[model samples]
Target: QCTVQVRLELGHRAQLRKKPTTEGFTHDWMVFVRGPEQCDIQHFVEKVVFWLHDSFPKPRRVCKEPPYKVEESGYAGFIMPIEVHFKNKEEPRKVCFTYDLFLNLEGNPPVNHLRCEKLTFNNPTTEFRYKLLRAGGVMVM
Candidate 1:
C-alpha cells in the first residue's frame, strides 16, 4: 500500500495572521498529503473530499496554477486552507488535536479518549517536533 498521509493546517501557503480580514478573522488550511512515488493520488483526494464533507462554510479545492506544489509523488497539489471564522480573536475557533483530528469549536465546541471507527493509512509512527515552513520556519503541533 502507498504511504498516503493527510492532515489539516492553519496556513498552508499564505501568511498566518489571526487578524480580521474582509473575510473575517481568517487564515488558510489544507488537506495536505505526501507519500511514495507509486501512489495513484486521485484515490487519495477522493477520500479527503469524502471526509471533509463537513465544515462551516465548506472547503474549496486549491488550484494548480502552480497551486500547492509542496506536492509529492503521492498526492500532488496544495489544496486551499479551510476558511475558518473565529467568533472573535480571543476565543480562537479551532484546535488541532492530532494530524487526523481537529476540533472546530464553532461546530460543537468539543474531545479525548481512544475511540475510532477507522484507522489511517499507516502504521503508528513517531512525530518529530520540526517540520519546515515556507519562510524557513519549523515546528508542528
Candidate 2:
C-alpha cells in the first residue's frame, strides 16, 4: 500500500465598508490543498475542484495547477465539497470530502481552518510507485 498525507486549509479575513459590488459580503476567504509541512503535491495531484456556495457565479471552480485553491467574498459561512484527482491512472481516479468554512470575523487578524487526510493505494502500479518514490511517499507492504 502507498500512503500520503493531504492537507486542506480555509482562510478568511473580515473587511469593513464592503465595495459597491459586494454590498453585504463581510469577508474574503480562500480554500486550498497543501501537503504536510507545505511539501510538494504537484507530483501526484492532477487537479482540484472546489464546490463553492451556489450563490456565487460559477460555483464549481476547477484548478489544474499548483496552489489549487478558490477565493471569494461572502457574508456567511457554509460547508462545501472539495474534489481531487490523481495524476496517475493506476491510482484512484478521484477522492472527495466536505470542508466547513467558518467565518469568525471577531478580530483583525485572519482566521484559518485546517484538516488532513491520508490517501492510500493498495499494490500500486510500478509506474505509480516510481512517482511516489520521487516524492518520498510512504510505502508499506
Candidate 3:
C-alpha cells in the first residue's frame, strides 16, 4: 500500500461572478498530498479522513469515501468537489457549489507528507462570500 500525506491550507474568498443573475456559488480550499504514485490508496483515504475530521468535527467522519478515484497506472491526483448550500425558510435557496484540492504524488510507500497548501473561495452566484473558519490535517494507517 502506498503511504500519502496531505497538507491543507486556508485561503481568501473571491467572487467568481456577480449575482442575482448567476446560477450558483463556489468556494475552494487547497489540499496538497505527497505519496507513492504506485499505491497511494491508503494515503488518499487518509487525506479524506483528515479533511472530514477537521472540517466537520461535530458530525465526525461524515465522509468515509475518497473524493477522487485513482488512475490505473497508480498515479493519483484530483480536484475534489466540495458542496456548499444556502437555505432560507426551509427551502433550498442556493445549491451545488464545487471546489478543488490538488494532490501530487511523489514516489513510493512512506510518502513524504500531505499539506493543504492553499484555499480559494469563489462565489459564482450572489455577492456573498464565506470565510474558512479553520483548516487542519490528520493521519491514517
Candidate 4:
C-alpha cells in the first residue's frame, strides 16, 4: 500500500490590450503529490491514468518519459502537462493546459508502506478548486 497526497495551485492573468498576439484573461491549474519511498511506481502511474480517463475523457496521453532518479534507492513519479485544442475558426481560439504530479519516496516495504489513506486540498480559490476528481484501483499479484 502507498499513500498519495496532492496539492493544487491556480494561476490567473489579465491583458490590458487586445491584439493578435495580445494575451487576454488566462487561467491555469496544477497538482502536486508527495508520498513515502516504498510506494510502487507502477501503481502510481495507473492511478494517474485512471484520473485522466475519468476526468478528461478526450485527454490524450501527450507523452511519457522515463522516471527521474531520486535520492537513495527511490524514484520520482511524473505526469507531464497536456494541452487541449479546439478546431474552430475564430479569434483567440487556442487554449493551453498543463499539470504535474510529484512523489516523494520514503519508508520501507512490507512492514511499513504508504497507503493513500487521506487526501486533502489547500488554497481553495474561486478561480479554481480541487474536487474529488476521480477514483480507481487495481490488483497485481
Q: Please give each candidate's TM-score.
A: 0.24, 0.80, 0.22, 0.22
Please provide, for model 1 over 30-132, each residue's C-alpha lDDT reduced to its tens digit, 9 standing for 90 to 100. 3343222332223222122212322434333332221222221111222233322212223222222223333233333222212121112222122211111
Q: What shift in Å separates residue 15 of candidate 2 from its native position after superposition? A: 6.8
lDDT of each: 0.26, 0.71, 0.27, 0.27
Cα deviation of 119, candidate 4, in Å: 26
Model 4 Cα lDDT, one tens digit per residue, 69-103: 11111123334443322122332222233434333
Superposed on all Cα atoms, the candidates' RMSDs to the truth, in angstroms, are 16.8, 3.0, 19.3, 19.3
Higher-ranked by TM-score: 2 or 4: 2
lDDT of 3 by residue, 2-71 (tens): 2223333222222222344444322222232322333322321223322232333242222333333221
Better of 2 and 3 by lDDT: 2
What is the model-wide C-alpha lDDT for candidate 4? 0.27
Off by over 4 Å in 3: 1-75, 90-92, 107-141
Could you tell me the TM-score of candidate 2? 0.80
Residue 54's C-alpha lDDT in candidate 3?
A: 32
The candidate that achieves the highest lDDT relative to the unseen native structure: 2
Model 2 spans > 4 angstroms off? 1-22, 105-109
